[PDB]
């Protein structure tokens, strides 16, 4: 089961532009589908790092995108991968 | 590392089944089938990495491979075509890059077997003129009336094959070039010293191995079935 | 094709040297082998070159390989009759059985033998069994003599063919003619030497 | 001042026809090269990625790799045919290759191979060998790979000579990127942590380079031993992110601060009070 971690590059302040990162790790095979969502909708033109792997041979990849947090809008990262029946979704919690 | 192929030569009809076999007692895992055609290098048909394995080569179409054991690798033409007329070469090897080639198998696929005919063989003895002029004696062997042109002519003195002093025509000539399925003739010379030919304990034999029909091939004509066979002619030396 | 040989064919006279060329686009080029193939026979290995800039020798055969230029030559010194054959160039793309071989189409070499002591003649030979049948043997002519087919299509004539009595170090050309005709008439359509022996 | 140079290759063979090979190259934790399957050439991801190699030396090295990629792809396919039906597609193969640089012309090189995610083969000395735990069927592929003297000679030279030299040049040319200092920025936040009446505080630290860092929760001058450091997580701009959590009692949040020490701050520790 791929681990998914969502976090902002800068301290989040409502209204202010920022970058949102989705770090996907501990998965294999390396065929994976990563989506970053705003209010459940697919954000267009998400940048991906080149896929790499750690000492233990497991894969990781960094997705990131521009975002401006608000009181209302929700942000998430959705991962499809053969090691799961249904896609896994981790919500950005500003507090976490 | 010795590799053997059988048969060494084969005449077949279109639609017939032909099996080319390769044996190798070197305990090589790897075996390879090629065909050689004029104007081309050898081209890979099928290969095998071991018992039960067969792999498509560069030109596999029309051929099935079969690796029943480490030793034997077979090339099967289920429905033979004239385009499969060729010389077929088998090779074996271990994990190293060297492939060790067999001596080759000649295959001719005809449209029809109706005209297949074994040779007449005649041996022509040396002229006394030649003997007294050169102190050498030339025997001539003549194979005639055969179709197709798949023959091996050889010379035998006292039951042992001779190569020294021999030359055979590089190709059979056509007896009726105007006609479609012309029969063939082939000549060979064996030249010895006169004293060798003059020795009456020397037995000379010209042998032609002819490649024709097998046991299983059907035959509907009234003449003898023109099967693969040997025809020879012989003479003894004399003063 | 990825392997090309030059010349396609050539004729040389006994004792002369010749150079055979092989050019390839095969990548990578682990090794290159030269094969000799006599007419109707199998593949005899002459040499295998493996280095970037390699040179080998095996008697009268020597070879070079330049991997940068993707080029090999085979040199035959002092050709003999038995050098008459097809010479085939092969490049292997791996140093192991994972390799594919890439075969050139070959170069045909014909070596014309040196007939030192010619003695042109036309003999009649008689059949072992039925003595009424015969052939005409045109023999012992030098390699400057050509043999043409017959004008009559009932008469048969072979191409010339050279035999080698190895133990006597002696070579002779011959041709055979037969029909159903005499040996005086047999080689009419050929320009044969003036001193040609016709025995009674 | 020890840097490890890692060339990481991932190869997928879905079936007999389809395959792809992608590579990335790391010097420490900075990416120096990328070689996508779609690209004929290797891409520099830094201005100094060619190191101290001349354009001609680089071309020659890249050419060697271009031949390798095509050849590797066909070799695996042929090895699969050789072992059939023992092993079958899909297949993943990973290589980890490079050298670890020590002070004063000392280095170790390595070349480790993983099959379906398990380390099974390395190059060692002058040959390929299986490692402990590896299945026995690999003995035939190893025998075949070890037959190729030409690959062996080339790999020996790549590991023993080329890797250490190249990396030595990389360290010179990329000194200012490798020795960069980027300042951490911290911020605080809180959540309910599946408990009766407990809160979890979170100290976020982001934008720091290099990786070594110290983050502890503190009441005055008393290091809270409950502090839990998370994993180092990357930013897109080649800086690092880290969060340290402290499990506390609601109402008792007052008093707590988050202290952050990092080489880039030059003695001026960051302190955020709740
Ligand atoms: C590694 C440090 C690099 C530091 C410097 C470069 C840094 C710059 C960034 C570069 C980024 C590169 C990204 C890729 C990173 C991963 C690469 C690490 C592995 C490198 C392996 C290098 C292999 C090179 C050789 C090669 O291509 N062999 C290939 C081509 O070999 C032929 O061509 C050569 C032409 O040079 C030689 O022939 C010429 C010759 C003859 C005689 C002599 Cl003396 C010399 C030459 C040779 O003899 C020929 O056979 C050969 O096909 C190899 O087998 C390819 C695969 C090797 C890896 C195998 C891994 C084990 C897998 C086990 C699988 C088991 C599972 C099976 C189901
Ligand atoms: C490259 O360096 C290796 C040794 O270094 C080790 O392997 C490299 C590929 C890297 O991973 C290094 O980080 C690692 O430390 C040389 O290997 C050695 O080669 C010599 C001969 O060339 C071997 O000597 C043999 O010893 C055996 C006894 O076990 C005898 O049977 C032989 O007669 C012979 O004397 C030596 O064992 C081997 N070392 C190891 C550990 O395998 C390699 O030669 C070198 N190559 C070049 C071209 O520089
Ligand atoms: C990965 O790269 C290789 C080489 O660029 C691709 O292989 C080529 O694919 C095309 C068809 O798309 C073939 O016609 C070529 O002959 C192949 N090249 C070689 C050297 O065999 C391969 O398709 C790429 N893989 C993917 C999934 O895109
Ligand atoms: C091979 O694998 C690819 C990707 O998994 C697939 O889309 C393709 O159809 C497969 N090809 C065959 C011949 O099965
Ligand atoms: Na073997
Ligand atoms: Na690659
Ligand atoms: Na291969």
Tab-separated table of N, CA, C and O and ligand atoms in Angstrom, chain D residues 12 17-22 36-40 69-70 73 77, ligand 3:
chain	number	residue	atom	x	y	z
D	12	UNK	N	11.098	-1.873	-16.835
D	12	UNK	CA	9.858	-2.656	-16.851
D	12	UNK	C	9.747	-3.415	-18.173
D	12	UNK	O	9.854	-2.811	-19.236
D	17	UNK	N	7.143	-7.893	-26.052
D	17	UNK	CA	7.376	-6.751	-26.937
D	17	UNK	C	7.700	-5.486	-26.127
D	17	UNK	O	8.737	-4.858	-26.344
D	18	UNK	N	6.803	-5.131	-25.199
D	18	UNK	CA	6.832	-3.846	-24.476
D	18	UNK	C	7.876	-3.838	-23.348
D	18	UNK	O	7.887	-4.718	-22.489
D	19	UNK	N	8.719	-2.802	-23.329
D	19	UNK	CA	9.599	-2.536	-22.198
D	19	UNK	C	9.964	-1.049	-22.155
D	19	UNK	O	9.913	-0.355	-23.160
D	20	UNK	N	10.354	-0.570	-20.976
D	20	UNK	CA	10.916	0.758	-20.873
D	20	UNK	C	11.982	0.766	-19.774
D	20	UNK	O	11.881	0.042	-18.779
D	21	UNK	N	13.014	1.583	-20.005
D	21	UNK	CA	14.117	1.791	-19.093
D	21	UNK	C	14.279	3.298	-18.855
D	21	UNK	O	14.430	4.059	-19.797
D	22	UNK	N	14.263	3.699	-17.582
D	22	UNK	CA	14.433	5.078	-17.157
D	22	UNK	C	15.524	5.123	-16.082
D	22	UNK	O	15.604	4.220	-15.262
D	36	UNK	N	15.392	9.557	-19.522
D	36	UNK	CA	14.089	9.036	-19.866
D	36	UNK	C	14.212	7.992	-20.984
D	36	UNK	O	15.153	8.015	-21.767
D	37	UNK	N	13.233	7.084	-21.058
D	37	UNK	CA	13.158	6.070	-22.118
D	37	UNK	C	12.978	6.736	-23.493
D	37	UNK	O	13.480	6.225	-24.492
D	38	UNK	N	12.255	7.865	-23.530
D	38	UNK	CA	11.869	8.559	-24.783
D	38	UNK	C	13.052	9.338	-25.374
D	38	UNK	O	13.020	9.692	-26.543
D	39	UNK	N	14.084	9.600	-24.564
D	39	UNK	CA	15.237	10.396	-24.976
D	39	UNK	C	16.377	9.487	-25.456
D	39	UNK	O	16.691	8.486	-24.818
D	40	UNK	N	16.988	9.857	-26.584
D	40	UNK	CA	18.167	9.176	-27.128
D	40	UNK	C	19.421	9.536	-26.316
D	40	UNK	O	20.392	8.776	-26.315
D	69	UNK	N	21.961	0.453	-23.255
D	69	UNK	CA	20.533	0.446	-22.992
D	69	UNK	C	19.816	-0.506	-23.961
D	69	UNK	O	18.960	-1.292	-23.546
D	70	UNK	N	20.157	-0.399	-25.249
D	70	UNK	CA	19.611	-1.242	-26.314
D	70	UNK	C	19.988	-2.704	-26.054
D	70	UNK	O	19.172	-3.588	-26.252
D	73	UNK	N	18.383	-4.322	-22.955
D	73	UNK	CA	16.975	-4.594	-23.225
D	73	UNK	C	16.842	-5.939	-23.945
D	73	UNK	O	15.986	-6.748	-23.585
D	77	UNK	N	15.442	-9.868	-22.449
D	77	UNK	CA	14.433	-10.563	-23.251
D	77	UNK	C	14.941	-11.968	-23.600
D	77	UNK	O	14.197	-12.937	-23.516
E	3	LIG	C1	11.486	2.752	-24.823
E	3	LIG	O1	12.480	3.127	-25.765
E	3	LIG	C2	12.748	2.195	-26.815
E	3	LIG	C3	13.881	2.747	-27.691
E	3	LIG	O2	13.692	4.149	-27.968
E	3	LIG	C4	11.477	1.926	-27.621
E	3	LIG	O3	11.714	0.875	-28.576
E	3	LIG	C5	11.382	1.282	-29.915
E	3	LIG	O4	9.966	1.250	-30.114
E	3	LIG	C6	9.511	1.432	-31.460
E	3	LIG	C7	7.984	1.367	-31.478
E	3	LIG	O5	7.438	2.390	-30.631
E	3	LIG	C8	10.149	0.371	-32.361
E	3	LIG	O6	9.675	0.454	-33.713
E	3	LIG	C9	11.661	0.556	-32.308
E	3	LIG	O7	12.336	-0.375	-33.162
E	3	LIG	C10	12.107	0.347	-30.874
E	3	LIG	N1	13.540	0.556	-30.768
E	3	LIG	C11	14.380	-0.456	-30.557
E	3	LIG	C12	15.829	-0.087	-30.382
E	3	LIG	O8	13.989	-1.614	-30.498
E	3	LIG	C13	10.334	1.525	-26.694
E	3	LIG	O9	9.091	1.440	-27.404
E	3	LIG	C14	10.176	2.532	-25.567
E	3	LIG	N2	9.149	2.010	-24.694
E	3	LIG	C15	7.986	2.615	-24.507
E	3	LIG	C16	7.009	1.919	-23.604
E	3	LIG	O10	7.708	3.673	-25.024
